Each structure stands twice: as structure tokens, then as C-alpha cells.
Amino acid sequence: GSSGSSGRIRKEPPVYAAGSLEEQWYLEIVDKGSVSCPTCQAVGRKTIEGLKKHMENCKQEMFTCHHCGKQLRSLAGMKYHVMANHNSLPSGPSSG
């Protein structure tokens, strides 16, 4: 057996903070209807909740060579494009 009752007002702000990203993304929705990914910025979601899960893994780090300025997802592959194309073996101030 059991019993009980309650009833009070609810005047509190949403999970969002008074100055956080969540709020920003939220607007893009309440204004447009959907929000894009701040990481890839190619695919969005109907709301944040859904996006969060997306960025939870998508959140990756991009790189960009300096010699030429190549852009590759896999750091390894890139770091190799330099030693291959920008192969400057330390020998002398000249080649010949």
C-alpha cells in the first residue's frame, strides 16, 4: 500500500546555462528548426540531444602541413606526405 500528493510551480531555466554553447545551438533550432555540427559543419540534427551523440565521436582534431599546406584526416598519412615530398635530407647547404 501507499499514498501521497503534491503540487507546486516550476519557474526554472532549462538544462542550458546563462552563457553556454547549448543555448547557442538551441537557438539555431528555435529559429530555423535544426542545428549543424560545430566540428564538421556538414550535417546537423533536429535538436541538440541528437547532435551531442554525434559530436561525442565526430569531435576529432584536424591537421594542416606547413611546407605546402596539405590537409589530411589521418595524421600518419600526412606526416608521411612531408617526408616523401618535402624530403630534405641533412647533408649540406647545397645539392651539387
- Sites of contact with Zn ion (CB under 5 A): 37, 39-40, 58, 65, 67-68, 70
Name which of 34 and 39 has its Cβ closer to Zn ion.
39
Q: In 3D, which of 64, 82, 81, 84 has the Cα closest to residue 73? A: 64
CB of 73 to Zn ion, least distance (A): 13
Q: Locate 35 and state its grid cell.
A: 542545428
CB of 19 to Zn ion, least distance (A): 23
CB of 83 to Zn ion, least distance (A): 10
* DSSP characters over 7-60: --------SS-TT-HHHHHHHIIIIIS-EE-TTT-S-EESSHHHHHHHHHHH--
Name which of 14 and 69 has its Cβ closer to Zn ion.
69
Name which of 3 and 71 has its Cβ closer to Zn ion.
71
- φ and ψ at residue 62, rounded to 5 degrees: -95, 155
Name which of 16 and 70 has its Cβ closer to Zn ion.
70
